UniProtKB/Swiss-Prot annotation, chain A:
Disruption phenotype: Deletion does not affect EsxN and PPE41 secretion. It is found in: Cytoplasm. It comes from Mycobacterium tuberculosis (strain ATCC 25618 / H37Rv). It comes from the Bacteria. Specific chaperone for cognate PE/PPE proteins. Plays an important role in preventing aggregation of PE/PPE dimers. Its main location: cytoplasm. GO terms for cellular component: cytoplasm; peptidoglycan-based cell wall; plasma membrane. Keywords: Chaperone, Cytoplasm. Interacts specifically with ESX-5-dependent PE/PPE proteins. Forms a 1:1:1 heterotrimeric complex with the PE25/PPE41 dimer, via PPE41. Binding of EspG5 does not cause conformational changes in the PE25/PPE41 dimer. Forms a 1:1:1 heterotrimeric complex with the PE8/PPE15 dimer, via PPE15. The lineage of its organism: Bacteria, Bacillati, Actinomycetota, Actinomycetes, Mycobacteriales. Belongs to the EspG family. InterPro entries: EspG. This is ESX-5 secretion-associated protein EspG5. The keyword Cytoplasm applies.
UniProtKB/Swiss-Prot annotation, chain B:
Belongs to the mycobacterial PPE family. The PE25/PPE41 dimer induces both a strong humoral and cellular immune response. The dimer induces necrosis, but not apoptosis, in mouse macrophage cells. It also induces activation and maturation of mouse dendritic cells and drives Th2-biased immune responses. Pfam families: PPE. The lineage of its organism: Bacteria, Bacillati, Actinomycetota, Actinomycetes, Mycobacteriales. Forms a heterodimer with PE25. The dimer forms a 1:1:1 heterotrimeric complex with EspG5. PPE41 interacts directly with EspG5. This is PPE family protein PPE41. It comes from Mycobacterium tuberculosis (strain ATCC 25618 / H37Rv).
UniProtKB/Swiss-Prot annotation, chain C:
One of its GO terms (biological process) is protein heterotrimerization. The PE25/PPE41 dimer induces both a strong humoral and cellular immune response. PE25 protein alone induces low response. The dimer induces necrosis, but not apoptosis, in mouse macrophage cells. It also induces activation and maturation of mouse dendritic cells and drives Th2-biased immune responses. Disulfide bonds: none annotated. One of its GO terms (cellular component) is extracellular region. The keyword Protein transport does not apply. It comes from Mycobacterium tuberculosis (strain ATCC 25618 / H37Rv). Residues 1-85 form the PE domain. This is PE-PGRS family protein PE25. Belongs to the mycobacterial PE family. InterPro entries: PE-PGRS_N. One of its GO terms (molecular function) is protein heterodimerization activity.
């Protein structure tokens, strides 16, 4: 059922099916022979047309009603930045430590596109509710790095104040001895310790967010679910659905599903299971 | 040529750099002059042949006119080709001007990239991540736009050149 | 009429001079075309126009050979009918 192509092979499918863009997280080239005869041996292109089943999947990515995205990392998540001087402009490379997962649906059809290295893999996927989406993400993350939920209590802090305070804290390497501003907002000693570790020296990170499409427009989720593994526990940061409030949470199975629900409930056009 | 192979920093910089169309405009004036002078040449040649005929009517000169017929025709075809060159150079200059105009300015690309880096610098808690992806979509839209601007430029220039057919060698007379 | 051939030879060489002169006068302008920008479309255009000017110059050189031989033929024609009286 599943298919695996590189970035150039993916561009050929775009040409063969006249698809312009797909999710930017896949980092392909827009569309405005020897590489073919490879996809013929794998049964992707029969005669000179894309297989009916694979064509269908690619058309979901070509025009989804919804994209739900997960950026995973081993170590600190870099959000696509490679530090290398000779990196060309608009490089299609992704850092060696990143796995990108786009879950797209058009109508009732849920498709997955996973980019790792230079390889994009396409396949059908089973998605029903926020739980099943949380599951897929946690499975993906656990595969990189196992960790238990930090020993902390959920707390809600004002988003603006927490960013300002986290930006100073960053300047001192997120040192727990400089955690006093966060302590004064009423965040636990234990939370400040665990969060400092997750921010200063993570073993694995995950950002989850989404996008929704209407007639003549698009819009991102107002909230992002972020997971980080440091010394003494996985922690879950996400914005409550509303200025704004950040939830800081132990990454329990439950609160992780709550956070995914919040991401999905912060899309601009409402109901996300059924939308078109 | 698929210029979408290349990022918008490449397609935009390439169109903004270089000397401009002055040298093509000057060549167009030069080709106009040739059109003018070679039409005069053609007209003088017809008059010379006709007045030779009028001065000495009879078989010898008629056979001379016959042996000149290929060259007279060639000369007419030359003049028709000459009168197309100025036109098509100006069509190409326009094509260049519209490509220059429609291409995405560099500042817009650099700002996208600079804005994106600021969000990343401030993304410890991960809450800018979707805005970061919107900016990547915007960059990809610049890539796309430049791609289609260069496609249309290629096709305009291509059509113009296709109307400038090759010079044929003159036939002899006797 | 012999003299008519002689007259024509002179006029044909005068027409030849004009073709040669116009070619030369503007050759520096037709062959100095630069690409207006650094892209490959601009370069393909400029390169075509330069080559097109060069081929036009070969062509006029050829046509000036053809005209000179016409003038020579008219002259030699005139010296036959004049040296037959």
């Amino acid at each position: 059922t599943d298919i695996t192509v590189n970035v150039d092979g993916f561009w050929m499918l775009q040409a063969l099916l006249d698809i312009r863009h797909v999710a930017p997280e896949l980092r392909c080239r827009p569309y405005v022979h020897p590489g073919m005869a490879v996809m013929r041996e794998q049964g992707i292109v029969v005669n000179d047309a894309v297989n009916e089943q694979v064509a269908a999947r690619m058309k979901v990515l070509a025009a989804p009603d919804l994209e739900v995205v997960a950026l995973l990392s081993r170590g600190k998540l870099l959000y696509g930045v490679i530090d290398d001087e000779n990196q060309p402009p608009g490089s299609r490379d992704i850092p060696d430590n990143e796995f990108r997962v786009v879950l797209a649906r058009r109508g009732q059809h849920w498709v997955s596109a996973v980019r790792v290295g230079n390889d994009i893999t396409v396949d059908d996927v089973t998605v029903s509710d926020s739980a099943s989406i949380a599951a897929l993400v946690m499975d993906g993350l656990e595969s990189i790095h196992h960790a238990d939920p930090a020993a902390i209590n959920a707390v809600n802090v004002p988003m603006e104040e927490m960013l300002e305070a986290t930006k100073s804290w960053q300047e001192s390497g997120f040192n727990v001895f400089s955690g006093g501003d966060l302590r004064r907002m009423g965040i636990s000693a234990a939370t400040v310790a665990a969060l400092g570790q997750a921010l200063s020296d993570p073993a694995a990170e995950v950002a989850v967010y989404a996008r929704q499409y209407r007639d003549d427009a698009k819009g991102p989720s107002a909230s992002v679910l972020s997971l980080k593994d440091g010394s003494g526990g996985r922690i879950a940061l996400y914005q409550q659905a509303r200025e704004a409030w950040l939830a800081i949470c132990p990454a329990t199975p439950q609160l992780v599903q709550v956070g995914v629900k919040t991401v999905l409930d912060t899309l601009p056009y409402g109901e996300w299971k059924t939308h078109s | 040529m698929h210029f979408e192979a290349y990022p918008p920093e490449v397609n935009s910089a390439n169109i903004y750099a270089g000397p401009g169309p002055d040298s093509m405009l000057a060549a167009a004036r030069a080709w106009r002059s040739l059109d003018v002078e070679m039409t005069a040449v053609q007209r003088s040649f017809n008059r010379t042949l006709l007045s030779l005929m009028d001065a000495w009517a009879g078989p010898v000169v008629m056979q001379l006119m016959e042996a000149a017929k290929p060259f007279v025709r060639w000369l007419t075809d030359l003049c028709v080709q000459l009168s197309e060159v100025e036109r098509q150079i100006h069509e190409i200059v326009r094509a260049y001007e519209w490509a220059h105009h429609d291409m995405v300015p560099l500042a817009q690309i650099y700002n996208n990239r600079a804005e994106r880096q600021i969000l990343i610098d401030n993304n410890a808690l991960g809450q800018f991540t979707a805005q970061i992806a919107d900016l990547d979509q915007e960059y990809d839209d610049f890539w796309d736009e430049d791609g289609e601007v260069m496609r249309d430029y290629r096709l305009r220039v291509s059509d113009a050149l296709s109307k400038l057919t090759p010079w044929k060698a003159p036939p002899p007379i006797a | 009429n012999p003299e008519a051939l002689t007259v024509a030879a002179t006029e044909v060489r005068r027409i030849r001079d004009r073709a040669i002169q116009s070619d030369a006068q503007v050759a520096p302008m037709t062959t100095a075309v630069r690409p207006p920008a650094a892209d490959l479309v601009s370069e393909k255009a400029a390169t075509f126009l330069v080559e097109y000017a060069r081929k036009y110059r070969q062509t006029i050189a050829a046509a000036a050979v053809v005209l000179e031989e016409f003038a020579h033929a008219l002259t030699t024609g005139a010296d036959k009918y004049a040296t037959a009286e």
